[PDB]
Paper text:
For the purpose of modeling dual-targeting concepts in immunocompetent mice, we applied and optimized controlled Fab-arm exchange (cFAE) for the efficient generation of surrogate murine bispecific antibodies (bsAbs). The recombination is driven by two matching point-mutations, F405L and K409R (EU-numbering), one in each parental IgG, that weaken the non-covalent CH3-CH3 interaction in the parental Abs enough to allow for the dissociation of half-molecules, but at the same time, strongly favor the heterodimerization that promotes bsAb yield and post-exchange stability upon re-oxidation. The mutational and structural analysis of the mouse CH3-CH3 interface suggested that the K409R mutation alone could not sufficiently destabilize the CH3-CH3 interaction to enable dissociation in the mmIgG1 and mmIgG2a backbones.
To determine the structural consequence of introducing the T370K mutation into the mmIgG2a CH3 domain, the crystal structure of the mmIgG2a-T370K Fc-region was determined. A network of conserved water molecules at the CH3-CH3 interface has previously been noted in high resolution crystal structures of the Fc-region of human IgG1 and IgG226. One water molecule, dubbed w2, is tetrahedrally coordinated by the side chains of T411, K409 and S364 from one CH3 domain and K370′ from the opposing CH3 domain, and the ability of R409 to displace this water, as observed in some human IgG4 CH3 domain-containing crystal structures, could contribute to the ability of IgG4 to undergo FAE26. Interestingly, the T370K mutation was observed to restore a w2 equivalent water molecule at the mmIgG2a CH3-CH3 interface coordinated by K409 and T364 from one domain and T370K’ from the other. Furthermore, water occupancy maps and side chain fluctuations obtained from 250 ns room temperature molecular dynamics simulations were highly similar for human IgG1 and mmIgG2a-T370K at the CH3-CH3 interface around positions F405 and K409 but differed from that for wild-type mmIgG2a. In particular, simulations indicated the presence of w2 at the interface of human IgG1 and mmIgG2a-T370K but not at the interface of wild-type mmIgG2a, consistent with the observations from crystal structures. Additionally, fluctuations of water-coordinating residues remained close to the crystal structure for human IgG1 and mmIgG2a-T370K; however, a significant shift of the K409 side chain away from the crystal structure position was observed in the simulation of wild-type mmIgG2a. Parallel to observations with a K370T mutation in human IgG4, the T370 present in most mouse backbones hypothetically alleviates the electrostatic clash with R409′ in the opposite CH3 domain, thus enhancing CH3-CH3 interface stability. In human IgG1 (and IgG2), a conserved water network is observed, wherein one specific water molecule is thought to shield electrostatic repulsion between K370 and K409′26.
Numbering used by the authors:
A (entry chain A): 237 to 443
B (entry chain B): 237 to 442
Amino acid sequence: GPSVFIFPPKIKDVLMISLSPIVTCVVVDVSEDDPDVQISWFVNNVEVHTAQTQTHREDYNSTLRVVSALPIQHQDWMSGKEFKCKVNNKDLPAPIERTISKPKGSVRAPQVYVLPPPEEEMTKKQVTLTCMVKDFMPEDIYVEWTNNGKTELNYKNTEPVLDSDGSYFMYSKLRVEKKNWVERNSYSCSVVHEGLHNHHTTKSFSR
Amino acid sequence: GPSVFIFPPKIKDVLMISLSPIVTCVVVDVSEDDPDVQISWFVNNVEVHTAQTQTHREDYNSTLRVVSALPIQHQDWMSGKEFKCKVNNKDLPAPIERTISKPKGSVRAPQVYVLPPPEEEMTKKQVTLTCMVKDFMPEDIYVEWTNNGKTELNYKNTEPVLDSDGSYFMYSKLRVEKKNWVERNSYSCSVVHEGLHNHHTTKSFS
Ligand SMILES: *[C@@H]1O[C@H](CO[C@@H]2O[C@@H](C)[C@@H](O)[C@@H](O)[C@@H]2O)[C@@H](O[C@@H]2O[C@H](CO)[C@@H](O[C@@H]3O[C@H](CO[C@H]4O[C@H](CO)[C@@H](O)[C@H](O)[C@@H]4O[C@@H]4O[C@H](CO)[C@@H](O[C@@H]5O[C@H](CO)[C@H](O)[C@H](O)[C@H]5O)[C@H](O)[C@H]4NC(C)=O)[C@@H](O)[C@H](O[C@H]4O[C@H](CO)[C@@H](O)[C@H](O)[C@@H]4O[C@@H]4O[C@H](CO)[C@@H](O)[C@H](O)[C@H]4NC(C)=O)[C@@H]3O)[C@H](O)[C@H]2NC(C)=O)[C@H](O)[C@H]1NC(C)=O
Ligand SMILES: *[C@@H]1O[C@H](CO[C@@H]2O[C@@H](C)[C@@H](O)[C@@H](O)[C@@H]2O)[C@@H](O[C@@H]2O[C@H](CO)[C@@H](O[C@@H]3O[C@H](CO[C@H]4O[C@H](CO)[C@@H](O)[C@H](O)[C@@H]4O[C@@H]4O[C@H](CO)[C@@H](O[C@@H]5O[C@H](CO)[C@H](O)[C@H](O)[C@H]5O)[C@H](O)[C@H]4NC(C)=O)[C@@H](O)[C@H](O[C@H]4O[C@H](CO)[C@@H](O)[C@H](O)[C@@H]4O[C@@H]4O[C@H](CO)[C@@H](O)[C@H](O)[C@H]4NC(C)=O)[C@@H]3O)[C@H](O)[C@H]2NC(C)=O)[C@H](O)[C@H]1NC(C)=O
């Protein structure tokens, strides 16, 4: 029969009041001969009727996939309410129910540092700027590099790693032209995390 | 019936000639009522007879698990030969065969840099050293920090990340006593990868 997966909102979406967090319930292995799936949503066991649901074909193996997106209030996530999807179908011996909520635990703001290129790289045409983000809990975080406020082109993030004390760390690596680095630059690391004031902080090499 | 999974050697083991790389074949859902499975191993379709096999109980669900560990020659893995386990038993309708080999692809040696602590930490008793390992392919790598050659305790590695040019990078973070680092400079980053000369390099602060 079908299988159901449940997915949280993106951390940036739930921490920035201007964005639209969504909880998503995905039904896979739905039969082409029985596409009708009934999906019911609950918030702390109260049924709600606001989800947007769409069906598509998975050509890889001739099955259907149903995607149900529930728009949520930021504060319902942050306050630890439980979101539940209940999936019914003729091809199921019982409804499938999946639940998700913001895990309850310690909160510690990240310490953010920007590191210059290693000295040995300074003979190269392109150099590497590193943003160290550490000591944070929970692991959910959003990190980007920006230049003059514009979300940067060539950076890449590591995933968070569990440190020896139970906090997490990650690094963000930015490649830049050495010319741009030595000349007046505004490269900045920007971090979104629930432990920060206004859920956001930036670090830069200069003002 | 049973299911068979096959696992590669650890990258450090297969790159270091002093270590012992192993290819492992795991049979799950063996019946406690019929524990006997026959496992045969082949390298480039040549049967080999050196594997060590054990059986044990999985009490979670009253099944057995059989683990067969083939000690391999490093060059067989590195040259792209296929390793095959073949699992049989009197009640299977046909044997189950699993194969594994080193993935094909390009090789790029890592560039390794050590980064000092952020200047903000330099007023603290403990500081953070960073080893930046980048531009490598394939993603299989081993990275550690050492202190006067002794493998260090308090470091943690990121996993590799796919970079914009199809190569990989990672970082390794080590916490040290500041006094000790500024005085003795005893900490170095050691990297084991296919692309390096002797499959190894070490990087120190200058
Ligand atoms: C038929 O084919 C399909 C398709 O196959 C795939 O695609 C084709 C083209 C081929 O390439 C093929 O090789 C591929 O496999 C098969 O469908 C797949 O079925 C398997 C199940 O068999 C599914 O596997 C689960 O995947 C989960 C992860 O899914 C995400 O990530 C993968 C990539 O890593 C994506 O492919 C998926 O689409 C998912 O992506 C996420 O989707 C979210 C929802 O949209 C996104 O979030 C939303 O994003 C929007 C913006 O877009 C907004 O931001 C919203 O706010 C937000 O909500 C999200 O961004 C996106 N992420 C990414 C990274 O892209 C796994 O989580 C899951 O693992 C769990 O379950 C396993 C049991 O099945 C178990 O073994 C695991 O241990 C794990 O168990 C859980 O563990 C946690 C703890 O960690 C516990 O809490 C739980 O208790 C426990 N739960 C359970 C249930 O056990 C599965 O591995 C796969 O998702 C699915 N793919 C697709 C595309 O649908 C199908 O099976 C084939 N059928 C047959 C019969 O062969
Ligand atoms: C009865 O219960 C048992 C036990 O259950 C478990 O334990 C209990 C207590 C509960 O906690 C329960 O929740 C647990 O599940 C059940 O047994 C399990 O059965 C499932 C299958 O149903 C097995 O799932 C596969 O797992 C593979 C990964 O296994 C490793 O990682 C897990 C942790 O994630 C470990 O638990 C395992 O033990 C494995 O660990 C590895 O073991 C290696 C061998 O020992 C180690 O390597 C060796 O290490 C030594 C040093 O120690 C040397 O270095 C050697 O050199 C070296 O070789 C290795 O270090 C170690 N790793 C880790 C991290 O520990 C998955 O890979 C596999 O996925 C494939 O197959 C799926 C289909 O089954 C498919 O959907 C997946 O997509 C995936 O498919 C593959 O995809 C790739 C591309 O992505 C393709 O290339 C392949 O073609 C494709 N393959 C296939 C076949 O399609 C499975 O998920 C599970 O391992 C097993 N657990 C154990 C412990 O045995 C049992 O099912 C129950 N029975 C019943 C009837 O209920």
